[PDB]
Curated annotation (Swiss-Prot), chain A:
Constitutes the soluble short form (S-MGM1) generated by cleavage by PCP1, which plays a central role in mitochondrial inner membrane fusion and cristae morphology. The transmembrane long form (L-MGM1) and the S-MGM1 form higher-order helical assemblies that coordinate the fusion of mitochondrial inner membranes. Inner membrane-anchored L-MGM1 molecules initiate membrane remodeling by recruiting soluble S-MGM1 to rapidly polymerize into a flexible cylindrical scaffold encaging the mitochondrial inner membrane. This is Dynamin-like GTPase MGM1, small form. It comes from Chaetomium thermophilum (strain DSM 1495 / CBS 144.50 / IMI 039719). The chain holds residues 224 to 268 of 939 of the full protein. GTP binds at residues 39, 41-44. Mg(2+) binds at residue 43. It is found in: Mitochondrion intermembrane space. Residues 36-43 are annotated as: G1 motif.
From Swiss-Prot, chain B:
Residues 35-38 are annotated as: G3 motif. Mg(2+) binds at residue 35. It is found in: Mitochondrion intermembrane space. This is Dynamin-like GTPase MGM1, small form. It comes from the Eukaryota. The chain holds residues 319 to 417 of 939 of the full protein. Constitutes the soluble short form (S-MGM1) generated by cleavage by PCP1, which plays a central role in mitochondrial inner membrane fusion and cristae morphology. The transmembrane long form (L-MGM1) and the S-MGM1 form higher-order helical assemblies that coordinate the fusion of mitochondrial inner membranes. Inner membrane-anchored L-MGM1 molecules initiate membrane remodeling by recruiting soluble S-MGM1 to rapidly polymerize into a flexible cylindrical scaffold encaging the mitochondrial inner membrane.
UniProtKB/Swiss-Prot annotation, chain C:
Constitutes the soluble short form (S-MGM1) generated by cleavage by PCP1, which plays a central role in mitochondrial inner membrane fusion and cristae morphology. The transmembrane long form (L-MGM1) and the S-MGM1 form higher-order helical assemblies that coordinate the fusion of mitochondrial inner membranes. Inner membrane-anchored L-MGM1 molecules initiate membrane remodeling by recruiting soluble S-MGM1 to rapidly polymerize into a flexible cylindrical scaffold encaging the mitochondrial inner membrane. Signal peptide: none annotated. It comes from Chaetomium thermophilum (strain DSM 1495 / CBS 144.50 / IMI 039719) (Thermochaetoides thermophila). It is found in: Mitochondrion intermembrane space. It comes from the Eukaryota. The chain holds residues 375 to 417 of 939 of the full protein. This is Dynamin-like GTPase MGM1, small form.
Length: 45, 83, 43
């Protein structure tokens, strides 16, 4: 299911690039953000 | 262990810039998660978390079983920015 | 709703009462709103 992981990878490198463009590169692709409470936070890490 | 001695020495050194990492393993599926400080000065930390959660990112909340679900901040701020 | 409860609670602990904070041993100390608030009104 090889074509399946890949679109993701091709997208992840691109996110990297928008991330690195420059100062005004306010623009970008989403990603996962991880939030957790302290018990929660230990749990998350 | 050497990754531990490294990123932890950046954790003690401490801009608000987020350090990047790339890790390659045959077991692991390629992903793209970012890990900000978890809720516990505090008003600052909360502030970063809101800013990051606002934008349309796919937010991953965790909750410890012991805590009431309503009580946990993780699921709660995910409700605050995503009703 | 959850902030109306915190208003009335704050109101109570701000004034000089001998505040009794409890904390379950599972939660980390720094996340327990009891002890967090106890240090908020009593440094």
């Amino acid at each position: 299911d090889d074509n399946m992981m890949f679109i993701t990878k091709k997208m992840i490198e691109i996110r990297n690039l928008l991330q690195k463009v420059g100062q005004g590169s306010t623009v970008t692709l989403p990603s996962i953000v991880v939030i957790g409470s302290q018990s929660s936070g230990k749990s998350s890490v | 262990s050497l990754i531990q001695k490294t990123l932890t020495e950046l954790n003690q050194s401490v801009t608000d810039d987020p350090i990047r990492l790339t890790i390659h393993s045959p077991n692991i599926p390629d992903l793209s998660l970012i890990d900000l400080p978890g809720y516990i000065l505090k008003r600052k930390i909360t502030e970063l978390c809101d800013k990051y959660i606002r934008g349309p990112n796919i937010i991953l909340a965790i909750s410890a079983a012991d805590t009431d679900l309503a009580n946990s901040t993780a699921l709660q701020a995910s409700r605050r920015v995503d009703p």
